[PDB]
């Protein structure tokens with residue numbers, strides 16, 4: 001039942017175009033240019049981070065996959081898409097604040113966005129589609145109820161999550177709900193409360209067939225499995241994603257949710273990282289491209305290692321005067337100067353390339 005089995009993963013043209021139009025013209029070294037071109041072919045998730053992406057980038061990518069598959073691709077290609085446009089998005093940090101606000105028609109806007117995505121996916125029932133649903137949202141509901149914007153958004157996040165899970169429960173779709181990372185929900189105190197929250201949402205959505213499990217480490221830098229805990233992980237015993245998942249799955253399973261996992265490794269190649277504290281998430285120094293996307297995980301509970309966050313796309317601006325400035329992005333272990341979240345950050349791309357493991 002692994003939705004990553006029996007397909008290959010399509011590398012999308014948005015990221016390929018970033019690398020060829022924004023990155024490569026800035027690289028002169030012949031070997032580095034060639035390595036950059038190779039990264040552009042690694043199949044990372046495409047993000048529906050703005051409403052305008054639905055009718056443009058989603059439809060174009062599904063059209064291109066259809067065309068490649070009709071031309072005889074073997075194995076057939078599958079799409080990898082992130083749904084990331086909740087109103088009052090990114091409730092615990094300014095950096096990825098979205099286009100919609102709950103107080104300004106955000107619920108209606110989001111339900112329409114989900115409905116349009118559904119319409120598109122139904123029309124592309126010939127393209128196997130793997131979705132990650134709303135990075136950070138439910139993890140914020142576990143740990144950030146002390147933050148007024150998160151507390152105020154919780155009931156809306158819950159309603160809209162259940163809406164998405166039901167609406168996008170289509171026969172050719174597999175969904176993974178975002179579930180934080182080892183250094184967030186994997187702390188032993190947070191992990192049972194997290195299991196309870198995720199299992200109840202699953203139950204309240206009616207246990208949709210298409211919900212395959214959870215995504216972890218999205219846009220973070222954790223190791224899958226290292227023998228020695230990186231110093232910044234102390235004193236969390238769940239110091240890597242393998243520890244987190246092996247602790248988390250039994251808890252979820254006892255509560256009726258036999259979740260399979262995908263694990264982001266797109267910025268996990270260099271361990272330990274240059275994070276001075278584990279909570280430093282923004283444009284972290286000392287990181288590299290990590291293990292390539294694969295279903296060959298060597299672990300029963302892990303469907304795939306994936307590249308969810310596309311390395312080179314910024315985590316947040318370092319401009320202290322900007323509306324979306326988060327103090328995390330101005331720290332000494334954040335690469336600077338950095339552009340707005342989601343925009344291309346070429347010096348970061350080069351860092352990831354230099355530190356890539358396996359190398360390009």
Ligand SMILES: OC[C@H]1CNC[C@@H](O)[C@@H]1O[C@@H]1O[C@H](CO)[C@@H](O)[C@H](O)[C@H]1O
Pocket residue numbers: 090092093096136143144181183184218219220278279280281
């Ligand atoms: O309060 C949120 C913290 C808790 N500690 C872990 C830290 O990662 C988390 O911050 C979020 O980190 C994710 C990436 O893992 C970011 O995408 C969020 O923007 C940030 O709030």
Ligand SMILES: OC[C@H]1CNC[C@@H](O)[C@@H]1O[C@@H]1O[C@H](CO)[C@@H](O)[C@H](O)[C@H]1O
Pocket residue numbers: 047048049090095096135136218219309310313314315316341342343
């Ligand atoms: O992980 C979700 C957000 C919030 N914090 C980490 C950061 O990297 C991420 O930003 C989003 O990244 C995606 C993929 O690059 C972009 O589409 C978004 O514009 C951006 O906000």
Ligand SMILES: *[C@@H]1O[C@H](CO)[C@@H](O)[C@H](O)[C@H]1NC(C)=O
Pocket residue numbers: 051052054055109112116
């Ligand atoms: C979102 O995009 C759709 C087309 O996909 C459009 O009809 C709708 O008006 C847009 N939503 C908002 C709130 O602008």
Ligand SMILES: [Ca+2]
Pocket residue numbers: 002295297298299300302303
């Ligand atoms: Ca397997």
Ligand SMILES: [Ca+2]
Pocket residue numbers: 357358
């Ligand atoms: Ca290696």
